[PDB]
Design an enzyme around this catalytic site. Sequence first.
Site, short mmCIF file in Angstrom:
data_model
loop_
_atom_site.label_atom_id
_atom_site.label_comp_id
_atom_site.label_asym_id
_atom_site.label_seq_id
_atom_site.Cartn_x
_atom_site.Cartn_y
_atom_site.Cartn_z
N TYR A 64 0.82 -1.21 0.00
CA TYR A 64 0.00 0.00 0.00
C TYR A 64 0.87 1.27 0.00
O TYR A 64 0.45 2.29 -0.56
CB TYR A 64 -1.08 -0.04 1.12
CG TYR A 64 -2.34 -0.76 0.66
CD1 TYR A 64 -3.37 -0.06 0.04
CD2 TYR A 64 -2.47 -2.15 0.79
CE1 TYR A 64 -4.52 -0.71 -0.42
CE2 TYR A 64 -3.61 -2.81 0.33
CZ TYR A 64 -4.63 -2.09 -0.28
OH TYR A 64 -5.77 -2.75 -0.72
N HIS A 120 -15.04 2.40 -1.70
CA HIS A 120 -13.98 1.49 -1.27
C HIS A 120 -12.95 2.17 -0.39
O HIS A 120 -11.91 1.59 -0.13
CB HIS A 120 -13.28 0.87 -2.48
CG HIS A 120 -14.11 -0.14 -3.22
ND1 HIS A 120 -13.71 -0.67 -4.43
CD2 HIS A 120 -15.30 -0.71 -2.93
CE1 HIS A 120 -14.62 -1.52 -4.86
NE2 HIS A 120 -15.59 -1.58 -3.96
N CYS A 131 -8.78 1.69 18.16
CA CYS A 131 -9.85 2.64 18.46
C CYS A 131 -10.77 2.98 17.28
O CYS A 131 -11.86 3.53 17.50
CB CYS A 131 -9.25 3.92 19.03
SG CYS A 131 -8.33 4.89 17.82
N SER A 213 -18.82 -0.75 -16.48
CA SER A 213 -20.13 -0.96 -17.11
C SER A 213 -21.19 -1.22 -16.05
O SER A 213 -20.87 -1.54 -14.90
CB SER A 213 -20.10 -2.08 -18.16
OG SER A 213 -19.21 -3.13 -17.81
N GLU A 239 -15.12 -0.84 -23.47
CA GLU A 239 -15.77 -2.01 -24.06
C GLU A 239 -16.73 -1.56 -25.16
O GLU A 239 -17.28 -0.46 -25.09
CB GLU A 239 -16.54 -2.80 -23.01
CG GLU A 239 -15.68 -3.42 -21.92
CD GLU A 239 -16.40 -3.52 -20.59
OE1 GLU A 239 -15.77 -3.19 -19.56
OE2 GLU A 239 -17.59 -3.91 -20.57
ZN LIG Z 1 -6.07 4.29 17.81
#
Ligand SMILES: [Zn+2]
Lengths: 264, 8
Positions: A64, A120, A131, A213, A239
């Site tokens: 990430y 997302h 927390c 789509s 597409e």
């Molecule tokens: Zn925390």
Amino acid sequence: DLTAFREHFAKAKHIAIITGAGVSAESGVPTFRGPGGFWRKWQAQDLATPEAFSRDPSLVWEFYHYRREVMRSKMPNPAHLAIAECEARLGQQGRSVVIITQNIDELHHRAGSKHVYEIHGSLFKTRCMSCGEVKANHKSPICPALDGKGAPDPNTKEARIPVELLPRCERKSCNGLLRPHVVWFGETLDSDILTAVERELEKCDLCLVVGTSSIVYPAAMFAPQVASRGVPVAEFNMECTPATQRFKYHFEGPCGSTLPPALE
Amino acid sequence: XVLXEYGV
Ligand SMILES: [Zn+2]
């Protein structure tokens, strides 16, 4: 047909634009399905799941971290800016435009878009494991121990970072391990966001789909809610459609070229 | 709550 869309575009008081990976892909962002084939050798299963984060949080954070840092050289493309400018131009007329996006790169926010829904989550937010606080975080590098780490070459030495030196929660009594505020495979969407999006998509009187789509997730959840009210739906993706059975509005080609003429 | 990609 273009001018048939443009007629609706002029009438429309409440536009909803759903965006997928195609739009992020035209800015050069790696999206693990199209561009940037894979990272090191790994697959979603040892990278983008809660299990994989529990087994090896160093490797997931390595991954990430890479994706946060590549964004410093990837910029908003014309689709991102045409949407954002359109929002502002229409908003001042008393006409809403909202973005529902599967993308986690924040490119819509950098483009100038304001009313965005990140279904997302975002690469540049952290959720704390203890927390549960959510914080924006664009710090580069996110934590010292990751500096220069997350290299994409399949034969890179793993950072193998002690967990207490991975990104921790700045609220001092906590010190919890953080994670990307991202929706991983096998997790659910946020209920409050889905409600808000339901509300927006019921309000709307013209719905755009860009970079994906309506057949496929996530557009398929709601595009039945909008089409069932006779609301026109317009796709701006790469597409094609069938030899005879056309879409109601579908503009084949790159979003960077198709969309900015459409929204002027 | 909704699984992303509906599970697979
Ligand atoms: Zn925390």
